[PDB]
Scaffold this motif. Structure first.
Motif, PDB file in Angstrom:
ATOM      1  N   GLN A  36       1.008  -1.118  -0.085  1.00 32.31           N
ATOM      2  CA  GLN A  36      -0.086  -0.083   0.087  1.00 32.31           C
ATOM      3  C   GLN A  36       0.739   1.351   0.125  1.00 32.31           C
ATOM      4  O   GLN A  36       0.404   2.296  -0.213  1.00 32.31           O
ATOM      5  CB  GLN A  36      -0.786  -0.055   1.311  1.00 32.31           C
ATOM      6  N   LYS A  37       2.039   1.027   0.289  1.00 34.27           N
ATOM      7  CA  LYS A  37       2.885   2.386   0.144  1.00 34.27           C
ATOM      8  C   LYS A  37       3.501   2.505  -1.098  1.00 34.27           C
ATOM      9  O   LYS A  37       3.960   3.455  -1.605  1.00 34.27           O
ATOM     10  CB  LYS A  37       4.246   2.190   1.209  1.00 34.27           C
ATOM     11  N   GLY A  38       3.792   1.147  -2.066  1.00 36.40           N
ATOM     12  CA  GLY A  38       3.993   1.387  -3.214  1.00 36.40           C
ATOM     13  C   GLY A  38       5.436   1.046  -3.378  1.00 36.40           C
ATOM     14  O   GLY A  38       5.979   1.423  -4.372  1.00 36.40           O
ATOM     15  N   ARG A  39       6.024   0.341  -2.489  1.00 38.98           N
ATOM     16  CA  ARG A  39       7.455  -0.127  -2.453  1.00 38.98           C
ATOM     17  C   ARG A  39       7.548  -1.201  -3.779  1.00 38.98           C
ATOM     18  O   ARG A  39       6.576  -1.877  -4.222  1.00 38.98           O
ATOM     19  CB  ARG A  39       7.627  -1.074  -1.279  1.00 38.98           C
ATOM     20  N   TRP A  40       8.695  -0.743  -4.406  1.00 36.51           N
ATOM     21  CA  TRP A  40       9.020  -1.701  -5.477  1.00 36.51           C
ATOM     22  C   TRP A  40       9.368  -3.162  -5.003  1.00 36.51           C
ATOM     23  O   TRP A  40       8.853  -4.251  -5.445  1.00 36.51           O
ATOM     24  CB  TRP A  40      10.230  -1.196  -6.342  1.00 36.51           C
ATOM     25  N   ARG A  41      10.301  -3.278  -4.020  1.00 36.42           N
ATOM     26  CA  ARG A  41      10.609  -4.563  -3.399  1.00 36.42           C
ATOM     27  C   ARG A  41       9.803  -4.909  -2.170  1.00 36.42           C
ATOM     28  O   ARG A  41       9.857  -4.156  -1.215  1.00 36.42           O
ATOM     29  CB  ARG A  41      11.942  -4.530  -2.852  1.00 36.42           C
ATOM     30  N   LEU A  42       8.856  -5.840  -2.136  1.00 37.40           N
ATOM     31  CA  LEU A  42       8.007  -6.166  -1.157  1.00 37.40           C
ATOM     32  C   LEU A  42       8.864  -6.832  -0.139  1.00 37.40           C
ATOM     33  O   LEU A  42       8.401  -6.793   1.074  1.00 37.40           O
ATOM     34  CB  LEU A  42       6.980  -6.952  -1.460  1.00 37.40           C
ATOM     35  N   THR A  43       9.892  -7.403  -0.483  1.00 37.02           N
ATOM     36  CA  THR A  43      10.787  -7.957   0.532  1.00 37.02           C
ATOM     37  C   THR A  43      12.191  -7.947   0.065  1.00 37.02           C
ATOM     38  O   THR A  43      12.450  -7.906  -1.079  1.00 37.02           O
ATOM     39  CB  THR A  43      10.384  -9.522   0.731  1.00 37.02           C
ATOM     40  N   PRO A  44      13.114  -8.131   1.013  1.00 42.34           N
ATOM     41  CA  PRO A  44      14.546  -7.944   0.512  1.00 42.34           C
ATOM     42  C   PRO A  44      14.675  -9.296  -0.719  1.00 42.34           C
ATOM     43  O   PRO A  44      14.097 -10.256  -0.664  1.00 42.34           O
ATOM     44  CB  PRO A  44      15.350  -8.723   1.729  1.00 42.34           C
ATOM     45  N   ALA A  45      15.674  -8.956  -1.760  1.00 42.62           N
ATOM     46  CA  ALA A  45      15.913  -9.769  -2.462  1.00 42.62           C
ATOM     47  C   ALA A  45      17.291 -10.929  -2.369  1.00 42.62           C
ATOM     48  O   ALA A  45      18.007 -10.104  -1.542  1.00 42.62           O
ATOM     49  CB  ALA A  45      16.168  -9.196  -4.028  1.00 42.62           C
ATOM     50  N   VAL A  46      17.296 -11.706  -3.075  1.00 38.42           N
ATOM     51  CA  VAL A  46      18.521 -12.685  -2.613  1.00 38.42           C
ATOM     52  C   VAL A  46      19.073 -13.499  -4.030  1.00 38.42           C
ATOM     53  O   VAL A  46      18.439 -14.459  -4.228  1.00 38.42           O
ATOM     54  CB  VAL A  46      18.194 -13.514  -1.464  1.00 38.42           C
ATOM     55  N   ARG A  47      20.174 -13.134  -4.511  1.00 37.96           N
ATOM     56  CA  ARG A  47      20.583 -13.613  -5.586  1.00 37.96           C
ATOM     57  C   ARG A  47      21.557 -15.104  -5.658  1.00 37.96           C
ATOM     58  O   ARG A  47      22.228 -15.367  -6.288  1.00 37.96           O
ATOM     59  CB  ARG A  47      21.852 -12.937  -6.271  1.00 37.96           C
ATOM     60  N   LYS A  48      20.542 -15.973  -5.015  1.00 40.62           N
ATOM     61  CA  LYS A  48      20.952 -17.443  -4.876  1.00 40.62           C
ATOM     62  C   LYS A  48      19.579 -18.210  -4.791  1.00 40.62           C
ATOM     63  O   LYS A  48      18.712 -17.713  -4.222  1.00 40.62           O
ATOM     64  CB  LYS A  48      21.861 -17.840  -3.465  1.00 40.62           C
TER      65      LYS A  48
END
Ligand SMILES: [Mg+2]
Ligand SMILES: [Mg+2]
Ligand SMILES: [Mg+2]
Ligand SMILES: [Mg+2]
Ligand SMILES: [Mg+2]
Ligand SMILES: [Mg+2]
Ligand SMILES: [Mg+2]
Ligand SMILES: [Mg+2]
Ligand SMILES: [Mg+2]
Ligand SMILES: [Mg+2]
Ligand SMILES: [Mg+2]
Ligand SMILES: [Mg+2]
Ligand SMILES: [Mg+2]
Ligand SMILES: [Mg+2]
Ligand SMILES: [Mg+2]
Ligand SMILES: [Mg+2]
Ligand SMILES: [Mg+2]
Ligand SMILES: [Mg+2]
Ligand SMILES: [Mg+2]
Ligand SMILES: [Mg+2]
Ligand SMILES: [Mg+2]
Ligand SMILES: [Mg+2]
Ligand SMILES: [Mg+2]
Ligand SMILES: [Mg+2]
Ligand SMILES: [Mg+2]
Ligand SMILES: [Mg+2]
Ligand SMILES: [Mg+2]
Ligand SMILES: [Mg+2]
Ligand SMILES: [Mg+2]
Ligand SMILES: [Mg+2]
Ligand SMILES: [Mg+2]
Ligand SMILES: [Mg+2]
Ligand SMILES: [Mg+2]
Ligand SMILES: [Mg+2]
Ligand SMILES: [Mg+2]
Ligand SMILES: [Mg+2]
Ligand SMILES: [Mg+2]
Ligand SMILES: [Mg+2]
Ligand SMILES: [Mg+2]
Ligand SMILES: [Mg+2]
Ligand SMILES: [Mg+2]
Ligand SMILES: [Mg+2]
Ligand SMILES: [Mg+2]
Ligand SMILES: [Mg+2]
Ligand SMILES: [Mg+2]
Ligand SMILES: [Mg+2]
Ligand SMILES: [Mg+2]
Ligand SMILES: [Mg+2]
Ligand SMILES: [Mg+2]
Ligand SMILES: [Mg+2]
Ligand SMILES: [Mg+2]
Ligand SMILES: [Mg+2]
Ligand SMILES: [Mg+2]
Ligand SMILES: [Mg+2]
Ligand SMILES: [Mg+2]
Ligand SMILES: [Mg+2]
Ligand SMILES: [Mg+2]
Ligand SMILES: [Mg+2]
Ligand SMILES: [Mg+2]
Ligand SMILES: [Mg+2]
Ligand SMILES: [Mg+2]
Ligand SMILES: [Mg+2]
Ligand SMILES: [Mg+2]
Ligand SMILES: [Mg+2]
Ligand SMILES: [Mg+2]
Ligand SMILES: [Mg+2]
Ligand SMILES: [Mg+2]
Ligand SMILES: [Mg+2]
Ligand SMILES: [Mg+2]
Ligand SMILES: [Mg+2]
Ligand SMILES: [Mg+2]
Ligand SMILES: [Mg+2]
Ligand SMILES: [Mg+2]
Ligand SMILES: [Mg+2]
Ligand SMILES: [Mg+2]
Ligand SMILES: [Mg+2]
Ligand SMILES: [Mg+2]
Ligand SMILES: [Mg+2]
Ligand SMILES: [Mg+2]
Ligand SMILES: [Mg+2]
Ligand SMILES: [Mg+2]
Ligand SMILES: [Mg+2]
Ligand SMILES: [Mg+2]
Ligand SMILES: [Mg+2]
Ligand SMILES: [Mg+2]
Ligand SMILES: [Mg+2]
Ligand SMILES: [Mg+2]
Ligand SMILES: [Mg+2]
Ligand SMILES: [Mg+2]
Ligand SMILES: [Mg+2]
Ligand SMILES: [Mg+2]
Ligand SMILES: [Mg+2]
Ligand SMILES: [Mg+2]
Ligand SMILES: [Mg+2]
Ligand SMILES: [Mg+2]
Ligand SMILES: [Mg+2]
Ligand SMILES: [Mg+2]
Ligand SMILES: [Mg+2]
Ligand SMILES: [Mg+2]
Ligand SMILES: [Mg+2]
Ligand SMILES: [Mg+2]
Ligand SMILES: [Mg+2]
Ligand SMILES: [Mg+2]
Ligand SMILES: [Mg+2]
Ligand SMILES: [Mg+2]
Ligand SMILES: [Mg+2]
Ligand SMILES: [Mg+2]
Ligand SMILES: [Mg+2]
Ligand SMILES: [Mg+2]
Ligand SMILES: [Mg+2]
Ligand SMILES: [Mg+2]
Ligand SMILES: [Mg+2]
Ligand SMILES: [Mg+2]
Ligand SMILES: [Mg+2]
Ligand SMILES: [Mg+2]
Ligand SMILES: [Mg+2]
Ligand SMILES: [Mg+2]
Ligand SMILES: [Mg+2]
Ligand SMILES: [Mg+2]
Ligand SMILES: [Mg+2]
Ligand SMILES: [Mg+2]
Ligand SMILES: [Mg+2]
Ligand SMILES: [Mg+2]
Ligand SMILES: [Mg+2]
Ligand SMILES: [Mg+2]
Ligand SMILES: [Mg+2]
Ligand SMILES: [Mg+2]
Ligand SMILES: [Mg+2]
Ligand SMILES: [Mg+2]
Ligand SMILES: [Mg+2]
Ligand SMILES: [Mg+2]
Ligand SMILES: [Mg+2]
Ligand SMILES: [Mg+2]
Ligand SMILES: [Mg+2]
Ligand SMILES: [Mg+2]
Ligand SMILES: [Mg+2]
Ligand SMILES: [Mg+2]
Ligand SMILES: [Mg+2]
Ligand SMILES: [Mg+2]
Ligand SMILES: [Mg+2]
Ligand SMILES: [Mg+2]
Ligand SMILES: [Mg+2]
Ligand SMILES: [Mg+2]
Ligand SMILES: [Mg+2]
Ligand SMILES: [Mg+2]
Ligand SMILES: [Mg+2]
Ligand SMILES: [Mg+2]
Ligand SMILES: [Mg+2]
Ligand SMILES: [Mg+2]
Ligand SMILES: [Mg+2]
Ligand SMILES: [Mg+2]
Ligand SMILES: [Mg+2]
Ligand SMILES: [Mg+2]
Ligand SMILES: [Mg+2]
Ligand SMILES: [Mg+2]
Ligand SMILES: [Mg+2]
Ligand SMILES: [Mg+2]
Ligand SMILES: [Mg+2]
Ligand SMILES: [Mg+2]
Ligand SMILES: [Mg+2]
Ligand SMILES: [Mg+2]
Ligand SMILES: [Mg+2]
Ligand SMILES: [Mg+2]
Ligand SMILES: [Mg+2]
Ligand SMILES: [Mg+2]
Ligand SMILES: [Mg+2]
Ligand SMILES: [Mg+2]
Ligand SMILES: [Mg+2]
Ligand SMILES: [Mg+2]
Lengths: 48, 92
Positions: A36-48
RNA sequence: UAGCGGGCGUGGAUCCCUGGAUGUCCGAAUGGGGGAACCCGGCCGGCGGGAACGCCGGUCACCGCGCUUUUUGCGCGGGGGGAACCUGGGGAACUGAAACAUCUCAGUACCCAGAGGAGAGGAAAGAGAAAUCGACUCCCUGAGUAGCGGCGAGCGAAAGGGGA
RNA sequence: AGCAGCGCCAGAGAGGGUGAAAGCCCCGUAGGCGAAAGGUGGGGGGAUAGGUGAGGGUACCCGAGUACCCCGUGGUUCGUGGAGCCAUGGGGGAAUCUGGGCGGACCACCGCCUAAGGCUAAGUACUCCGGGUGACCGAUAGCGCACCAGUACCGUGAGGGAAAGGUGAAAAGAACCCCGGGAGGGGAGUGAAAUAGAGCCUGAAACCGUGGGCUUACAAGCAGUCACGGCCCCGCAAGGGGUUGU
RNA sequence: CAGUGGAGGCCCGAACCGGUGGGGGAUGCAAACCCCUCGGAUGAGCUGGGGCUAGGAGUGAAAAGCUAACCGAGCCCGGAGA
RNA sequence: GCCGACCCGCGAGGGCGGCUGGAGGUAAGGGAAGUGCGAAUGCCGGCAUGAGUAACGAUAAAGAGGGUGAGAAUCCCUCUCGCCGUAAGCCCAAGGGUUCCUACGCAAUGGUCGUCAGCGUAGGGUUAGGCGGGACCUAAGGUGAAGCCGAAAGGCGUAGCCGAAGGGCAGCCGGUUAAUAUUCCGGCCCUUCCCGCAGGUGCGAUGGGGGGACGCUCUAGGCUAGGGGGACCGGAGCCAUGGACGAGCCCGGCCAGAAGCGCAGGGUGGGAGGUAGGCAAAUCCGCCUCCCAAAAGCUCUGCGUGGUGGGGAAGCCCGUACGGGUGACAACCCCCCGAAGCCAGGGAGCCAAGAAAAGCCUCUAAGCACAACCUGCGGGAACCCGUACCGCAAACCGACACAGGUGGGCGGGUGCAAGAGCACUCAGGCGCGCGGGAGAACCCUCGCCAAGGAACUCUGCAAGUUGGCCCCGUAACUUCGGGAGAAGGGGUGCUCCCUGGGGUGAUGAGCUCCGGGGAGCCGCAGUGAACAGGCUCUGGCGACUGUUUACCAAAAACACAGCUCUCUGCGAACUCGUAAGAGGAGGUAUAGGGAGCGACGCUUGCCCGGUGCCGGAAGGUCAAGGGGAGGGGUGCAAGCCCCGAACCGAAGCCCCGG
């Protein structure tokens, strides 16, 4: 000297991950606000 | 839905290297099995493949102005055609 | 959004409204798993020489209600989202009282469940003093009145009357 | 589109744009017309579900762990108060109109209403969304965001959270020559304007600089002020300006 | 008694763990470092990986220590313009 | 907006003129407000001061010639020099995420420079049945059908499911790219799945059983990695500067490999009968009975060998780059040292008593016995993800090309008693991304010092002395172990000679390991450098090893073995939870919870008035409740309604004792 940020991906994802957030009523609201804030990432990303 | 697994040939000294031997490498579709790249190129260049090899090509990240980019991902497969066979189609 | 390279339009193109189609993967996410966007399947068809392998089409979560001969079944429904509004369950403290404990803040903040274009409430086991009124909700008023109150700080109606 | 001359329209002289200041140029405005398709739609019409009588007898029925009473609490203006009413966690526990409840303890009278099943539109609330309007903002304002912002960046995470708008009418965005590796410049050229030349309108202040005028190396200072004097500058002079020696 | 044997929160000492004293550093190489010195070093040892425990709560060979570089009550958003 | 010495106003202001600017502005008269800033360690931005100052991030270190280029201390090349070498080299894992390789390029990034780069642009680059992970197993834990609990949200939880650096599973050597390689290629060697067949057998699992299946310390035999010597094998070369043509110098003398054979090890009793057990399914397992072999046999693994494939140096020519040739047709052999690795589920001792599950084997049930299992062969099939590069760091965590931090493997030679220590050094890699000069104070790190030798000082703080090994020797006291490295001493190098023992070989030589005796030589000095204790005496506290205030305290504090008290009979006490439940504990008073003291020795006195606790069927007071004399309100009454004495009523307190 050992600082505090000691990355490890299983950890990152097991703990702030999406599956994880949905799991509890607490994290559900987090996703809720996040979205609802409009964050692009809803949660931390992880490249593995 | 078959001329869809094959995308286009990869064009690179290294690609050419193996035309001489039995080895045609091309851009396949990212979700393709080796089992399918097979029956694909097989029904596509009328050869028999004895061997498929694959690998993803994590797409490099380019950019322009402030706007920070990210090129799409890919998957070379490389096919080893039955002995003697060839693909004139590629041998230009 | 210029450019390189090519095209299309009065045999009405572009474009705008309406309906349809297609719509990978994840997400209630529902075949199973899982570290969301990944991995692994059963069944019935199909594809390749095709048994092994792979892919393609379909289908398989769970709960509740109904029907059915226990059952296997079959249908209808649910699940999740929504700015604020609403309803129910739960529910603070700073603060005020020039300390503070009753009291106040406030049934507020918030948490939870649900509802929906609203929600609630709603056809008297009512009002309350006129042998009167006549569901409910909303505004004006009554009224800062009646009262409540360590009769402190404060809190604070209703009936009736005018309206929708 | 200004000024001038002569015209016209107006159910339209709201507003916007066009190289500046336009009713008549452009888009609009007033007025008026339009839907195959989807949505909406009793507002109009029609139909169906349903619904409507008087007297007499009978005493069959009229919502149960309910009323009611007591204990513990909640709601109400009601803080245990003379404390009812409504609601209900614990205990006891009825009747069916000679029934029950209420009218602020209680009782008598009088009067009101019919609990313990359910449903019901409108009037009401709000504003993600669309539009209209402003004695509302005009880029440190207004939303955090006029701009590619819930971004960049910061935090393990919940979460925090910026900065950044304007050439010109038109790109006509400066061929070409010259110095330079480039950058950047000097010419040439475009433009009304280029100290409008590309984070380019306007371009203030602090701040750095170049040139010029007056001044300063025996002098004591909140830095100015008052006086006289020298120099420089504007004016014919009377005058004024700048500077500062004592 | 000799032999054999090979015990131990045993001894000396690297790795490894640690921080005793001094000097240095103090707008640092560094928001705890450097040098010399020093303690443990088969154990109540050190250590990778996978897990669980949290805010009046956890964990604590106990210092009110630690709980993401300030903990006699974490961080964030909220009540809040207490 | 900029300027003004003009005009008006008491002033805040207004006006006028000039220059800039280039499209808006808004009288008179009224109205309305986000209405006037110098200060708030105010908020935002800009720009100054300190100041050309401090710094330029390890004191491992430079120098020159040549090349490139607009421009080189700083880039390439060459030679010389220095530093690391249990690392400052090499391979894994994590984290990182294109940093890899090329080509072009230097605005910024780079603490200077930059032609360079880890930087900008672009193109390439990551290949797997066998490596890792998934189509396998299970661990803590998580999830969770059943079930239990909770106002809601949710909590607990069986079966099952998920979960790995643990279990199980089939690839070794070598070549090639600028950049990948058990992945491509070469060679040798394997694994599953399906199909057909041969042969064979009661087949068949999710169920039963076996096995997998385990600690610490010490350890044998054999072998491999690894390393040393070789007068022996191969090799292009070298004779310098006084000597040497030699048993000279320098280089190199390996790697993989199926069957079979050999060496070394692990595993395993065989046969028969009976059976009530492994939730009555069994030929299996268990248990009883007797007979045999006591070891072999059978089974598995390691090494060596082994058809054959591979590789193969110094030095020299071409060469920026980096290799390719030479380079042999290379040789490829002996001897010694030797693991912490292998055989591996080896052995012995010890007490603290040392995962699971699948694979695998076996037993049967249902079901099938034209199936199906099992062994061989033939033909076929074999997916998904990772694979670049960095990886003790300039590519990870530390805002930085940060002197910090980061798990596992390899980690050569010589010397020193040993070693992963120390000094030097291979391979490999670096000189730490500002230089140049000067040669003041002062600061840092370091060296030495006449005489003295703690006079310094809060304190020998700091420095120094001592230092390894070998032999001699060693006190109070003691808990008999200690105190001990007490103390204090002497020896240590090199040469020749005599000689003892251990190891491999064979008993011998050669190699190697540890010694003993004499003779002698040199220097100031022989663990000649580097590693490397100063010692004693006597108090205090604490028994001891340990623990601690991450970042000013390491201690006499905490802990500790041990002692006493106390609770707790098991659905234990106690703790967490609203509950369910869990922990206690799959424990049972030789146990568990609490408290204090704190090895060990000797001991621990008196005072129960107060407080706590324990006991005390009496009494005293004591709430709801029971009781109802007695009193009240109202009604015409029947009634309804209220108040209320005695009396009965727990725990607690009182009281009584310990
Ligand atoms: Mg880049
Ligand atoms: Mg369709
Ligand atoms: Mg989907
Ligand atoms: Mg799914
Ligand atoms: Mg399948
Ligand atoms: Mg199919
Ligand atoms: Mg066929
Ligand atoms: Mg279905
Ligand atoms: Mg029937
Ligand atoms: Mg909903
Ligand atoms: Mg509200
Ligand atoms: Mg107060
Ligand atoms: Mg006050
Ligand atoms: Mg006050
Ligand atoms: Mg509420
Ligand atoms: Mg709804
Ligand atoms: Mg409405
Ligand atoms: Mg409604
Ligand atoms: Mg309702
Ligand atoms: Mg009714
Ligand atoms: Mg009602
Ligand atoms: Mg009436
Ligand atoms: Mg008072
Ligand atoms: Mg109130
Ligand atoms: Mg109205
Ligand atoms: Mg209205
Ligand atoms: Mg006219
Ligand atoms: Mg106009
Ligand atoms: Mg039309
Ligand atoms: Mg119309
Ligand atoms: Mg209507
Ligand atoms: Mg009709
Ligand atoms: Mg009808
Ligand atoms: Mg009648
Ligand atoms: Mg009741
Ligand atoms: Mg009542
Ligand atoms: Mg109340
Ligand atoms: Mg009340
Ligand atoms: Mg009161
Ligand atoms: Mg009453
Ligand atoms: Mg009740
Ligand atoms: Mg009354
Ligand atoms: Mg009456
Ligand atoms: Mg709107
Ligand atoms: Mg709007
Ligand atoms: Mg803004
Ligand atoms: Mg701005
Ligand atoms: Mg916006
Ligand atoms: Mg960060
Ligand atoms: Mg141009
Ligand atoms: Mg020019
Ligand atoms: Mg020309
Ligand atoms: Mg150049
Ligand atoms: Mg330019
Ligand atoms: Mg102009
Ligand atoms: Mg100008
Ligand atoms: Mg420029
Ligand atoms: Mg500029
Ligand atoms: Mg200026
Ligand atoms: Mg002048
Ligand atoms: Mg003078
Ligand atoms: Mg002048
Ligand atoms: Mg020992
Ligand atoms: Mg020890
Ligand atoms: Mg010691
Ligand atoms: Mg260690
Ligand atoms: Mg510590
Ligand atoms: Mg300290
Ligand atoms: Mg200092
Ligand atoms: Mg451990
Ligand atoms: Mg707290
Ligand atoms: Mg914070
Ligand atoms: Mg408040
Ligand atoms: Mg002007
Ligand atoms: Mg105006
Ligand atoms: Mg007005
Ligand atoms: Mg203001
Ligand atoms: Mg203001
Ligand atoms: Mg001020
Ligand atoms: Mg200050
Ligand atoms: Mg300065
Ligand atoms: Mg100086
Ligand atoms: Mg300096
Ligand atoms: Mg330096
Ligand atoms: Mg040195
Ligand atoms: Mg040089
Ligand atoms: Mg050249
Ligand atoms: Mg040149
Ligand atoms: Mg040149
Ligand atoms: Mg080491
Ligand atoms: Mg990059
Ligand atoms: Mg590489
Ligand atoms: Mg540069
Ligand atoms: Mg630079
Ligand atoms: Mg730097
Ligand atoms: Mg160059
Ligand atoms: Mg160049
Ligand atoms: Mg160069
Ligand atoms: Mg192979
Ligand atoms: Mg698959
Ligand atoms: Mg249960
Ligand atoms: Mg499992
Ligand atoms: Mg494997
Ligand atoms: Mg490489
Ligand atoms: Mg390689
Ligand atoms: Mg046959
Ligand atoms: Mg069998
Ligand atoms: Mg049978
Ligand atoms: Mg089995
Ligand atoms: Mg079995
Ligand atoms: Mg088993
Ligand atoms: Mg078993
Ligand atoms: Mg094990
Ligand atoms: Mg050997
Ligand atoms: Mg050898
Ligand atoms: Mg020879
Ligand atoms: Mg000579
Ligand atoms: Mg040599
Ligand atoms: Mg030499
Ligand atoms: Mg033998
Ligand atoms: Mg039996
Ligand atoms: Mg029998
Ligand atoms: Mg039997
Ligand atoms: Mg049998
Ligand atoms: Mg059998
Ligand atoms: Mg052998
Ligand atoms: Mg061999
Ligand atoms: Mg061999
Ligand atoms: Mg051989
Ligand atoms: Mg041979
Ligand atoms: Mg076969
Ligand atoms: Mg690779
Ligand atoms: Mg490091
Ligand atoms: Mg960093
Ligand atoms: Mg550096
Ligand atoms: Mg370490
Ligand atoms: Mg070694
Ligand atoms: Mg440096
Ligand atoms: Mg001396
Ligand atoms: Mg002296
Ligand atoms: Mg002397
Ligand atoms: Mg002396
Ligand atoms: Mg003296
Ligand atoms: Mg003294
Ligand atoms: Mg000292
Ligand atoms: Mg000495
Ligand atoms: Mg002593
Ligand atoms: Mg020597
Ligand atoms: Mg022999
Ligand atoms: Mg020592
Ligand atoms: Mg004494
Ligand atoms: Mg004494
Ligand atoms: Mg003592
Ligand atoms: Mg100690
Ligand atoms: Mg400390
Ligand atoms: Mg239990
Ligand atoms: Mg229990
Ligand atoms: Mg238990
Ligand atoms: Mg026990
Ligand atoms: Mg005693
Ligand atoms: Mg005593
Ligand atoms: Mg008695
Ligand atoms: Mg009486
Ligand atoms: Mg009476
Ligand atoms: Mg009477
Ligand atoms: Mg009576
Ligand atoms: Mg009695
Ligand atoms: Mg009692
Ligand atoms: Mg009593």
């Amino acid at each position: 000297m050992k600082r505090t940020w000691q990355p490890n991906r299983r950890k990152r994802a097991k703990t702030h991950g999406f599956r994880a957030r949905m799991r509890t009523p607490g994290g559900r609201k987090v996703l809720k606000r996040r979205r609802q804030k409009g964050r692009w990432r809803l949660t931390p990303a992880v490249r593995k | 839905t078959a001329y869809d697994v094959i995308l286009a040939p990869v064009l690179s000294e290294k690609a050419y290297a193996g035309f001489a031997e039995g080895k045609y490498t091309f851009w396949v579709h990212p979700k393709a099995t080796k089992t399918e790249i097979k029956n694909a190129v097989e029904t596509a260049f009328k050869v028999k493949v004895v061997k498929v090899n694959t690998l993803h090509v994590r797409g490099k990240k380019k950019r322009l102005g402030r706007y920070l980019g990210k090129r799409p991902d890919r998957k070379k497969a490389i096919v080893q055609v039955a002995p003697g066979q060839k693909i004139e189609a590629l041998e230009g």
